[PDB]
Amino acid sequence: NLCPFGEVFNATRFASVYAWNRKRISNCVADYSVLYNSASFSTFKCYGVSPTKLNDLCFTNVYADSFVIRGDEVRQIAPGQTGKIADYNYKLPDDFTGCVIAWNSNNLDSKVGGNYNYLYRLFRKSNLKPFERDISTEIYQAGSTPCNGVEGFNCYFPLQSYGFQPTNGVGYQPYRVVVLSFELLHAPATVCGPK
Amino acid sequence: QVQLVETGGGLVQPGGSLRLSCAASGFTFSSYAMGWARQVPGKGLEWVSYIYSDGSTEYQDSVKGRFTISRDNAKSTVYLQMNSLKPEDTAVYYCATEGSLGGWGRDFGSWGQGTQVTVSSQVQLVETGGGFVQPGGSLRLSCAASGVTLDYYAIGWFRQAPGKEREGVSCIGSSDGRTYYSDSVKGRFTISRDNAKNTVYLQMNSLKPEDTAVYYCALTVGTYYSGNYHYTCSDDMDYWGKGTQVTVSS
Ligand SMILES: *[C@@H]1O[C@H](CO)[C@@H](O)[C@H](O)[C@H]1NC(C)=O
């Protein structure tokens, strides 16, 4: 009863960071060694756990958040970070326990002329709470004049396309990111490593 | 801030060895770990080696033993040694540092230019039309964009006046030419696109002394949503031009 990590990492499509996807993983055997012992992930950070011993751990549930962002912002997916991604798109809590895994997907997710279907939130009145998701598209009031729902000089559409193109520099190429959160609740564990 | 410079790329025959040097600046090199990755044209980026601040090293399985990674804190440098190279190793190698100090595991936070190794067998904006114009006169500024490859993009005109922070002036979308003007410039400045080339014209009318400023033309990528194209001209812009001075005085 293997956990469906293939469905998440080798997913048919990846979601926009502003609308990041969450899959709940429960009641299965998780083999992380296949994950860590590979060259496929540029980043494999973990907080509160050791990567070598993940197969020794037992959890009540796992949440898999996934999305695409630019490479230069992947460092922002960490406790205590600031920036457009952490502030307006996906915010990790200070006490996060879990792993953030990321890899360049230019070969899968770029198109000549730009993929405009991937978006991120560029403007927001306040920072997101941890694990909060905001999918609203209200016009952002950047100046003193009310916008009344009309796009204009100081009244911005709140989302922005990355426009990933294959000729971008590596720092500006698309990276797919999956954050696995390990839920620790006062209950019996249902997702454990191989016995 | 953080800068990485890579050297040592070149041409090598099969079975040869190579040394690559990566030097870092702008941050505490000693405390941060280091990593080396490779990208093959047409294939995704893959990591080849990693070294921690404590001396621990991680080598990829398919390249274990053949590759070596070392660090010298005195010169704040990392050395990558390749032995028994094969045609499968032809790629562009990149040098990376930890994005954050916390956490456990290998991290690639910053990316350098990289160096290409093989085994033997940009958008530019130019602003013109600035100068001195008498009060109440008219002018025509022109922004020429070269090397533009994006199908849909937004072009904005901004100005910075003496004693005032840079502020927006006008914005245009390429797909439909929708015109956005600032409150202080509405009804006086007219922005338009060139039908033949990728040049944006900006006609100044009823110029006033306060209009004296350095004007810049900038370009960014547009947004697609719900079958419609939206264009935004904010402070954060993908590219910026040199700009030209416009002086409205007697
Ligand atoms: C997806 O499949 C490829 C097959 O080569 C494999 O290398 C990769 O690790 C898989 N990713 C995951 C974790 O699903």
Side-chain angles (χ1 to χ4, degrees), chain B residues 108-112 114-120:
Chain B
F108 296 165
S110 296
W111 302 99
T115 61
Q116 207 273 350
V117 71
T118 287
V119 179
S120 183

PDB file of all heavy atoms in Angstrom, chain B residues 108-120, unseen atoms left out:
ATOM      1  N   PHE B 108      20.195  24.750  -2.941  1.00  0.00           N
ATOM      2  CA  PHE B 108      20.702  25.581  -4.032  1.00  0.00           C
ATOM      3  C   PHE B 108      19.881  26.868  -4.036  1.00  0.00           C
ATOM      4  O   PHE B 108      18.828  26.943  -4.672  1.00  0.00           O
ATOM      5  CB  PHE B 108      20.609  24.854  -5.382  1.00  0.00           C
ATOM      6  CG  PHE B 108      21.460  23.614  -5.478  1.00  0.00           C
ATOM      7  CD1 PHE B 108      21.248  22.699  -6.495  1.00  0.00           C
ATOM      8  CD2 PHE B 108      22.462  23.356  -4.556  1.00  0.00           C
ATOM      9  CE1 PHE B 108      22.019  21.558  -6.594  1.00  0.00           C
ATOM     10  CE2 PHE B 108      23.235  22.216  -4.652  1.00  0.00           C
ATOM     11  CZ  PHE B 108      23.013  21.317  -5.671  1.00  0.00           C
ATOM     12  N   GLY B 109      20.367  27.881  -3.322  1.00  0.00           N
ATOM     13  CA  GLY B 109      19.641  29.130  -3.195  1.00  0.00           C
ATOM     14  C   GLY B 109      19.956  30.117  -4.300  1.00  0.00           C
ATOM     15  O   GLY B 109      19.046  30.678  -4.919  1.00  0.00           O
ATOM     16  N   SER B 110      21.242  30.337  -4.556  1.00  0.00           N
ATOM     17  CA  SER B 110      21.702  31.268  -5.574  1.00  0.00           C
ATOM     18  C   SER B 110      22.338  30.502  -6.726  1.00  0.00           C
ATOM     19  O   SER B 110      22.966  29.458  -6.528  1.00  0.00           O
ATOM     20  CB  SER B 110      22.710  32.265  -4.993  1.00  0.00           C
ATOM     21  OG  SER B 110      22.104  33.087  -4.011  1.00  0.00           O
ATOM     22  N   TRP B 111      22.163  31.025  -7.937  1.00  0.00           N
ATOM     23  CA  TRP B 111      22.692  30.411  -9.147  1.00  0.00           C
ATOM     24  C   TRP B 111      23.651  31.373  -9.831  1.00  0.00           C
ATOM     25  O   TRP B 111      23.331  32.554 -10.007  1.00  0.00           O
ATOM     26  CB  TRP B 111      21.563  30.020 -10.103  1.00  0.00           C
ATOM     27  CG  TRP B 111      20.568  29.086  -9.493  1.00  0.00           C
ATOM     28  CD1 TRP B 111      19.355  29.413  -8.963  1.00  0.00           C
ATOM     29  CD2 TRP B 111      20.705  27.670  -9.339  1.00  0.00           C
ATOM     30  NE1 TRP B 111      18.725  28.286  -8.493  1.00  0.00           N
ATOM     31  CE2 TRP B 111      19.533  27.202  -8.712  1.00  0.00           C
ATOM     32  CE3 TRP B 111      21.705  26.751  -9.673  1.00  0.00           C
ATOM     33  CZ2 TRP B 111      19.335  25.857  -8.412  1.00  0.00           C
ATOM     34  CZ3 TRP B 111      21.505  25.416  -9.375  1.00  0.00           C
ATOM     35  CH2 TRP B 111      20.329  24.982  -8.752  1.00  0.00           C
ATOM     36  N   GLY B 112      24.823  30.865 -10.215  1.00  0.00           N
ATOM     37  CA  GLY B 112      25.802  31.653 -10.930  1.00  0.00           C
ATOM     38  C   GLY B 112      25.641  31.546 -12.436  1.00  0.00           C
ATOM     39  O   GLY B 112      24.717  30.922 -12.956  1.00  0.00           O
ATOM     40  N   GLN B 113      26.576  32.182 -13.146  1.00  0.00           N
ATOM     41  CA  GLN B 113      26.535  32.157 -14.604  1.00  0.00           C
ATOM     42  C   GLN B 113      26.707  30.740 -15.139  1.00  0.00           C
ATOM     43  O   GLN B 113      26.000  30.327 -16.065  1.00  0.00           O
ATOM     44  CB  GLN B 113      27.615  33.078 -15.173  1.00  0.00           C
ATOM     45  N   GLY B 114      27.639  29.983 -14.571  1.00  0.00           N
ATOM     46  CA  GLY B 114      27.903  28.633 -15.018  1.00  0.00           C
ATOM     47  C   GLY B 114      28.892  28.586 -16.171  1.00  0.00           C
ATOM     48  O   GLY B 114      29.145  29.574 -16.859  1.00  0.00           O
ATOM     49  N   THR B 115      29.463  27.400 -16.377  1.00  0.00           N
ATOM     50  CA  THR B 115      30.452  27.183 -17.426  1.00  0.00           C
ATOM     51  C   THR B 115      30.092  25.936 -18.218  1.00  0.00           C
ATOM     52  O   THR B 115      29.720  24.912 -17.641  1.00  0.00           O
ATOM     53  CB  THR B 115      31.864  27.036 -16.843  1.00  0.00           C
ATOM     54  OG1 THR B 115      31.911  25.899 -15.972  1.00  0.00           O
ATOM     55  CG2 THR B 115      32.257  28.286 -16.066  1.00  0.00           C
ATOM     56  N   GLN B 116      30.210  26.024 -19.540  1.00  0.00           N
ATOM     57  CA  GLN B 116      29.892  24.911 -20.423  1.00  0.00           C
ATOM     58  C   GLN B 116      31.112  24.016 -20.601  1.00  0.00           C
ATOM     59  O   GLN B 116      32.224  24.509 -20.815  1.00  0.00           O
ATOM     60  CB  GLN B 116      29.415  25.425 -21.783  1.00  0.00           C
ATOM     61  CG  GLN B 116      28.485  24.471 -22.521  1.00  0.00           C
ATOM     62  CD  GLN B 116      29.232  23.455 -23.364  1.00  0.00           C
ATOM     63  OE1 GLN B 116      30.443  23.557 -23.556  1.00  0.00           O
ATOM     64  NE2 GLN B 116      28.509  22.464 -23.872  1.00  0.00           N
ATOM     65  N   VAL B 117      30.899  22.705 -20.510  1.00  0.00           N
ATOM     66  CA  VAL B 117      31.950  21.715 -20.707  1.00  0.00           C
ATOM     67  C   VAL B 117      31.449  20.687 -21.712  1.00  0.00           C
ATOM     68  O   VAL B 117      30.328  20.179 -21.583  1.00  0.00           O
ATOM     69  CB  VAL B 117      32.358  21.036 -19.385  1.00  0.00           C
ATOM     70  CG1 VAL B 117      31.256  20.112 -18.885  1.00  0.00           C
ATOM     71  CG2 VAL B 117      33.662  20.272 -19.561  1.00  0.00           C
ATOM     72  N   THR B 118      32.276  20.395 -22.715  1.00  0.00           N
ATOM     73  CA  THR B 118      31.956  19.435 -23.759  1.00  0.00           C
ATOM     74  C   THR B 118      33.161  18.537 -23.995  1.00  0.00           C
ATOM     75  O   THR B 118      34.311  18.965 -23.858  1.00  0.00           O
ATOM     76  CB  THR B 118      31.555  20.140 -25.068  1.00  0.00           C
ATOM     77  OG1 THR B 118      30.251  20.718 -24.922  1.00  0.00           O
ATOM     78  CG2 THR B 118      31.541  19.162 -26.236  1.00  0.00           C
ATOM     79  N   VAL B 119      32.890  17.285 -24.352  1.00  0.00           N
ATOM     80  CA  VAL B 119      33.924  16.282 -24.583  1.00  0.00           C
ATOM     81  C   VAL B 119      34.132  16.140 -26.083  1.00  0.00           C
ATOM     82  O   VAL B 119      33.177  15.895 -26.831  1.00  0.00           O
ATOM     83  CB  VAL B 119      33.544  14.933 -23.949  1.00  0.00           C
ATOM     84  CG1 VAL B 119      34.623  13.895 -24.219  1.00  0.00           C
ATOM     85  CG2 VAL B 119      33.314  15.096 -22.452  1.00  0.00           C
ATOM     86  N   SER B 120      35.378  16.293 -26.523  1.00  0.00           N
ATOM     87  CA  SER B 120      35.703  16.185 -27.934  1.00  0.00           C
ATOM     88  C   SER B 120      35.756  14.718 -28.360  1.00  0.00           C
ATOM     89  O   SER B 120      35.757  13.800 -27.537  1.00  0.00           O
ATOM     90  CB  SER B 120      37.036  16.870 -28.230  1.00  0.00           C
ATOM     91  OG  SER B 120      37.329  16.841 -29.616  1.00  0.00           O
TER      92      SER B 120
END
